[PDB]
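re: that complex we talked abt at group meeting.

here r the seqs, copy pasted straight from the sheet so there may be weird spacing, ignore it
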Amino acid sequence: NWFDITNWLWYIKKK
Amino acid sequence: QVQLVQSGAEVKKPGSSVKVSCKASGGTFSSYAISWVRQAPGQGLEWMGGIIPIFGTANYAQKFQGRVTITADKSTSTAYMELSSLRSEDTAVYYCAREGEGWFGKPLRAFEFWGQGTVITVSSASTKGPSVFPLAPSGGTAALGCLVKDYFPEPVTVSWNSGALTSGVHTFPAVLQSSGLYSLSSVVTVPSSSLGTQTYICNVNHKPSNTKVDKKVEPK
Amino acid sequence: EIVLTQSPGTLSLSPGERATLSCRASQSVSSSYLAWYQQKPGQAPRLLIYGASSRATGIPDRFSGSGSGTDFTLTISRLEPEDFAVYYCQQYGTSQSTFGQGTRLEIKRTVAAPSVFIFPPSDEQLKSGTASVVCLLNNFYPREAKVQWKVDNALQSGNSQESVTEQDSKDSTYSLSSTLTLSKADYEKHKVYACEVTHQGLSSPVTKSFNRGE
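got the structure back, here u go
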């Protein structure tokens, strides 16, 4: 899903 | 927090193209998707597409593929929506939305932040000022008004007594006539005893045509 | 891809009553990716619920989301005057996001009769070659009304346009303006001009008329 991409970007940024 | 400011209204001709901007302010800009939603007069919401500014690749609605170009300018933190081959059905209010920000940086997917909306009027009529006519009045309540007929485009602002009279005011929505022009009416109920002693002036301001009218309505 | 259907179309409820709006999806929505928005006239849509049930920031807990898959529900426990607006649902489980057609939630009050007024065309407009008669239906409820124009007792068709105001924020009533457009010659040829209003709370349709030339 496209609307999940913006969440994946948050992961590797903060994880 | 996050604020989205869009560009002013626009009046385009069929077949041409229009471009709307959306300047964001506050928070992160690269890793948050910006979407565009239109809404025709009387109709409902409609998703057109989105873009994650950190990527050049966007995500458009299959219905609009071939006419919509959504690009983001990270240098100015501004999203752009462009529509080509315009038709009268494209006459709508174009909102620019941004996904919600939850706890910490974890983003939501629903559209929490919104812009004020850009009124895109796709038509072929020429700019024209309205003709203001007095609706003269003939328990003790008297209704009077002004007919704001034949103007293009929307909108026209109406007030009574330079805006000092608000109680009982009914400014009706405009009706698009078959000639491409618009027309609306504004009425106000007042005590019948105050007809022969109070002056009622309806103020019409049509900004696109730079037309101000102060029509004095007096009973017959 | 996914077609959202909202129910009901229009909902008439009183302040303090319980509200329930349904949003059905043609297919299953992945991970309950459903959101509810509220929109008031002249303003932008305001987010209420995301993730089918999670409440947004600053939203009172009287809004509650439920459901998943093909059916979702927005529940407003106790209604307040600032809760009456248009409500939309939106799925984002697929890359092709879509919205519902909308559920308008208006205020229910006692039947209010319209005040009927009639305005002849102004002399300034008469010297322009067109005569516009106006019929005003001030402050009534419900919204459903019927206006008919009679030029010398002959009914008109395809020559009048009406407009209805939004819901009044004080008395919860509606108003209607009907404009009848005729040519100057057709106006000066006839005599009586009347507007007949049929509406609830009226024993029979009320006719407001004037005679041209007096």
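couple things i noticed - The interface with chain B takes residues 2-7, 9-10, 13-14 of chain A (CB under 8 Å). The helical segments of chain A are 2-14.
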